[PDB]
Design a protein around this motif. Structure first.
Motif, short mmCIF file in Angstrom:
data_model
loop_
_atom_site.label_atom_id
_atom_site.label_comp_id
_atom_site.label_asym_id
_atom_site.label_seq_id
_atom_site.Cartn_x
_atom_site.Cartn_y
_atom_site.Cartn_z
N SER A 62 0.79 -1.42 0.03
CA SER A 62 -0.13 -0.02 0.08
C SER A 62 0.72 1.35 0.08
CB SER A 62 -1.13 -0.17 1.22
OG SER A 62 -1.51 -1.12 1.30
N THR A 81 -7.05 12.48 0.90
CA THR A 81 -7.92 11.56 0.87
C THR A 81 -9.18 12.25 1.74
OG1 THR A 81 -7.75 10.91 3.19
CG2 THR A 81 -6.13 9.82 1.56
N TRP A 95 -5.55 7.34 5.51
CA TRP A 95 -6.23 6.24 4.65
C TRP A 95 -7.90 5.75 5.21
CZ3 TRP A 95 -1.83 2.17 3.91
CH2 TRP A 95 -0.66 2.75 3.03
N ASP A 153 -4.05 -6.61 0.39
CA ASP A 153 -3.53 -5.16 0.88
C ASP A 153 -4.39 -4.45 1.60
OD1 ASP A 153 -1.92 -2.24 -0.45
OD2 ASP A 153 -4.26 -2.12 -0.19
N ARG A 155 -4.92 -1.39 2.54
CA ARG A 155 -5.93 -0.25 2.10
C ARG A 155 -6.86 -0.64 1.35
NH1 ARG A 155 -3.49 5.25 -0.79
NH2 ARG A 155 -5.22 6.63 0.37
N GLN A 156 -7.07 -1.74 0.70
CA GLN A 156 -8.03 -1.95 -0.18
C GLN A 156 -9.03 -2.91 0.29
OE1 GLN A 156 -8.73 -0.50 -3.01
NE2 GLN A 156 -7.01 0.72 -2.62
N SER A 157 -8.63 -3.98 1.44
CA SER A 157 -9.46 -4.75 1.96
C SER A 157 -10.27 -4.23 3.47
CB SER A 157 -8.94 -6.10 2.56
OG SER A 157 -8.04 -5.95 3.43
N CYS A 160 -10.68 1.18 2.70
CA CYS A 160 -11.62 1.99 2.22
C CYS A 160 -13.14 1.59 2.41
CB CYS A 160 -11.55 1.32 0.76
SG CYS A 160 -11.94 -0.52 0.49
N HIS A 161 -13.47 0.82 3.73
CA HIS A 161 -14.78 0.62 4.08
C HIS A 161 -14.96 1.29 5.62
CE1 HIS A 161 -15.29 -2.34 0.84
NE2 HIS A 161 -14.41 -3.10 1.29
#
Ligand SMILES: [Br-]
Ligand SMILES: [Hg+2]
Length: 208
Positions: A62, A81, A95, A153, A155-157, A160-161
């Motif tokens: 990330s 962000t 993040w 990753d 940041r993506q799992s 982002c939620h």
């Protein structure tokens, strides 16, 4: 709610290789200065060879770099962000909502955090110190959580939620149209801050 699964999988997600924790705190403290961080500067703070510093970072896929190849993002980031994270006179970003609650204790400084409700767009803001939160506006602010995935990753799992919301009822309503997202839960910003404190205590207990 029961937070052990969240603490556990987040710890696993970040502590992939040793040194990560040891490198994380100085990196965050350098990034909090508002300028890109070089691997040699980290090497000097850590008294490691720069070969080790890049080794640790290569595992953190990330990680954000700038055009000079310097570090500008790792939890805290200079790249814009939804989560504005201000220390002193420097505007940084984070993040995710949980990041803003966690990093002030790790860097030893009080942050002015601001964002917008993910369901309604209403401005939200609060002051986050290493030990408490203050000026939570609006006062019923909530946070969404999901279960981090180990190999993915982070940041993506996870990141982002993980959002701020104007209130718990608002977030829950939002959550009802977000099915099949493992571990999805709504907590008050206070409960999320407590989760961050538990995470930090476990993370710090694993440093040199
Ligand atoms: Br549990
Ligand atoms: Hg995060």
């Amino acid at each position: 709610m029961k937070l052990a699964p969240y603490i556990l999988e987040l710890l696993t997600s970040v502590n992939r290789t040793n040194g990560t924790a040891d490198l994380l705190v100085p990196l965050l403290r350098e990034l909090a200065k508002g300028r890109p961080v070089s691997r040699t500067t980290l090497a000097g703070i850590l008294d490691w060879p720069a070969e080790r510093v890049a080794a640790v970072l290569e595992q953190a896929t990330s990680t954000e770099y700038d055009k000079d190849g310097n570090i500008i993002g790792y939890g805290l980031t200079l790249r814009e962000t939804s989560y504005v994270f201000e220390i002193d006179d420097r505007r940084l970003y984070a993040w995710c909502a949980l990041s803003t609650l966690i990093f002030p204790a790790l860097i030893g400084r009080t942050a002015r955090v601001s964002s917008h409700c993910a369901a309604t767009g209403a401005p939200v803001s609060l002051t986050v110190s290493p030990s408490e939160i203050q000026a939570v506006e609006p006062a019923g602010m909530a946070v969404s959580l999901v279960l981090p995935q180990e190999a993915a990753d982070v940041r993506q799992s996870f990141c982002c939620h993980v959002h701020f919301f104007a209130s718990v009822p608002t977030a829950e309503d939002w959550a009802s149209k977000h099915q099949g997202l493992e571990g999805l839960a709504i907590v008050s910003v206070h409960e999320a801050f407590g989760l961050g404190q538990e995470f930090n205590r476990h993370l710090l207990q694993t440093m040199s």
